C-alpha cells in the first residue's frame, strides 16, 4: 500500500493481497473513503485508486508549517454465502498528504523610467530712454523749440524706471550738426570724453549740468550758438546715453561734468571729473 500526493489528485496503490496471506480479498467490498475506484491490474496485483484531494470524504487540516489531507481507506467485507461468516477482518488505513503552505513568490525586473528637466533659458530686451526739451523750470515740455542767440536751451535726459532697479543715466557724447547725419560737417562735439561738457570751457558760456532731480533723470542748460555761414538756424543734436544701477559708483567714465570756474559736478563728487582736463 502506497500513496502519491499530486497537486490536484491523490493516487493510492493498494495491494490485492492486502493481508499478505495469499488470499483473494476484495470481492468489491472495499472503498477509499467513500469512493471505491479500482483500475484492473492482473499483473502486479495492485488495485489502483484515484481521488481528488478534496473528494471522497477527505479531511483538510492545517498546521503552522503544513496543510494535511486525510483519507480513510475502509474495508468492510460482506458475508459470503448464506451465512454470516466473514473470512477476514475489516481494514482501516490513515492516509495523510502534507503540503507546504508558505511561499515567498517574487517577480522579474521592472526598469524605472522618468525624465528630469534641466536647462538655461535666456531672453533679451531694451531699456527705455528719452532726450527731450524742457521749459525753464525743467518740469514741463517746451514744444517751442525755437530760441534766440544766447538764450538758454533747457534740456532733460531721462531713463524710465518702471519696475527696474534704481538707475542712473549718463550722457557719453553729444554732437551738433546742420543735418541729421552725426558725421556731416559741420559738426561740434559739445559733450565728449565721457560726459565732459566742454562748452563751458570753450566759450565761457553758462552752459552747465544741473543737479539730478532724480537718478533716472538728468538736466542741463546749453547756450545757443550758430555756425558761421549757416543761413538756417537748424541744429540736429545727436547724443548717446548710458544707464546703470544707482548702486554703481560715480567713476571716470560714468560721470557728468561741466567747467564752472574749474570742475565741480554731479552735485558734489567733483574729483570724478579730474580727467576732463584733456
Amino acid at each position: 500500500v502506497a500513496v502519491e500526493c499530486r497537486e490536484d489528485l491523490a493516487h493510492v496503490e493498494a495491494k490485492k493481497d492486502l493481508f499478505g496471506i495469499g488470499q483473494f480479498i476484495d470481492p468489491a467490498d472495499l472503498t477509499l473513503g467513500t469512493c471505491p475506484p479500482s483500475a484492473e491490474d492482473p499483473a502486479a496485483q495492485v488495485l489502483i485508486f484515484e481521488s481528488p484531494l478534496q473528494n471522497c470524504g477527505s479531511v483538510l487540516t492545517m498546521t503552522e508549517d503544513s496543510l494535511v489531507y486525510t483519507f480513510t481507506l475502509n474495508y468492510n467485507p460482506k458475508p459470503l454465502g448464506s451465512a454470516p461468516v466473514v473470512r477476514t477482518s475489516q481494514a482501516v488505513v490513515i492516509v495523510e498528504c502534507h503540503y507546504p503552505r508558505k511561499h515567498n513568490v517574487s517577480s522579474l525586473a521592472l526598469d524605472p523610467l522618468w525624465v528630469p528637466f534641466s536647462a538655461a533659458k535666456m531672453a533679451e530686451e531694451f531699456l527705455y530712454f528719452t532726450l527731450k526739451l524742457t521749459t525753464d523750470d525743467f518740469q514741463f515740455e517746451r514744444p517751442s523749440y525755437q530760441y534766440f542767440l544766447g538764450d538758454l536751451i533747457h534740456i532733460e535726459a531721462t531713463v524710465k524706471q518702471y519696475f527696474h532697479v534704481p538707475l542712473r543715466v549718463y550722457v557719453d557724447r553729444c554732437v551738433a550738426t546742420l543735418s541729421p547725419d552725426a558725421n556731416s560737417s559741420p559738426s561740434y562735439a559739445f559733450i565728449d570724453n565721457y560726459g565732459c561738457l566742454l562748452d563751458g570751457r570753450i566759450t565761457g558760456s553758462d552752459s552747465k549740468f544741473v543737479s539730478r532731480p532724480a537718478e533716472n533723470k538728468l538736466d542741463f542748460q546749453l547756450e545757443a550758438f550758430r555756425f558761421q555761414g549757416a543761413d538756417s538756424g537748424m541744429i540736429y543734436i545727436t547724443c548717446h546715453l548710458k544707464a546703470t544701477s544707482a548702486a554703481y559708483p560715480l567713476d571716470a567714465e560714468h560721470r557728468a561734468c561741466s567747467y564752472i570756474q574749474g570742475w565741480k559736478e554731479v552735485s558734489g563728487a567733483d574729483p570724478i571729473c579730474a580727467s576732463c582736463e584733456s
Partner: protein, 155 residues
C-alpha cells in the same frame, strides 16, 4: 508646435508678424502666435518676467502644486493658466530675483526649482516625482541713442 488650440497661450500682440513671433521663441500658424513645445521665458520693457511652462516638460507630468520660485511671496505664485501650461508673471524686483550689472547690460536672474518629494521607510528611500530646474536671465540693453532738433536765430 502641435499645441491643441483650446490651451494655446498667446504671445505678443494680434498684429505681430510671423518673423517677430518666431524671433521670441513662439510659433506661428499664419493667423496667430502661441507658445511652442518645451518652455519659454520672455522679458518686457516694463520690467517683468514672463515664464511659460508646459506640463510635459518632465515625466511624470508634474502636478503643478509643487513648484516654487527662488523666493516666495504673495505675488510669486502662478497666474492665470490652463490644463497643460502654467504662467508666472511678476516684477523683476520680486520673488528673490537677483540683479547684476555688466558694463553695457543689466541682468536679472531667477531659477525655478520644484520640490520633488522623497519617501522614507525603515529600510530605504524612494521617490515618484521627477526633479525640475529652470534657470533663466533677462538682459536689458543700455546704450540707447536719441536725437532732437532746435532752431536758433539772432535777436
Amino acid at each position: 508646435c502641435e499645441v491643441p488650440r483650446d490651451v494655446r497661450v498667446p504671445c505678443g500682440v494680434p498684429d505681430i508678424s510671423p518673423s517677430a513671433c518666431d524671433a521670441i521663441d513662439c510659433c506661428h500658424d499664419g493667423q496667430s502666435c502661441y507658445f511652442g513645445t518645451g518652455a519659454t521665458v520672455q522679458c518686457t520693457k516694463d520690467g517683468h518676467f514672463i515664464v511659460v511652462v508646459a506640463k510635459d516638460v518632465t515625466l511624470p507630468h508634474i502636478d503643478l502644486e509643487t513648484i516654487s520660485l527662488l523666493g516666495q511671496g504673495q505675488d510669486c505664485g502662478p497666474a492665470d493658466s490652463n490644463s497643460a501650461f502654467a504662467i508666472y508673471y511678476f516684477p523683476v524686483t520680486y520673488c528673490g530675483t537677483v540683479v547684476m550689472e555688466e558694463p553695457g547690460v543689466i541682468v536679472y536672474e531667477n531659477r525655478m526649482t520644484s520640490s520633488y518629494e522623497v519617501g522614507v521607510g525603515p529600510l530605504g528611500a524612494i521617490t515618484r516625482d521627477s526633479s525640475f530646474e529652470l534657470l533663466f536671465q533677462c538682459r536689458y540693453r543700455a546704450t540707447s541713442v536719441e536725437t532732437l532738433v532746435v532752431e536758433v536765430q539772432p535777436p
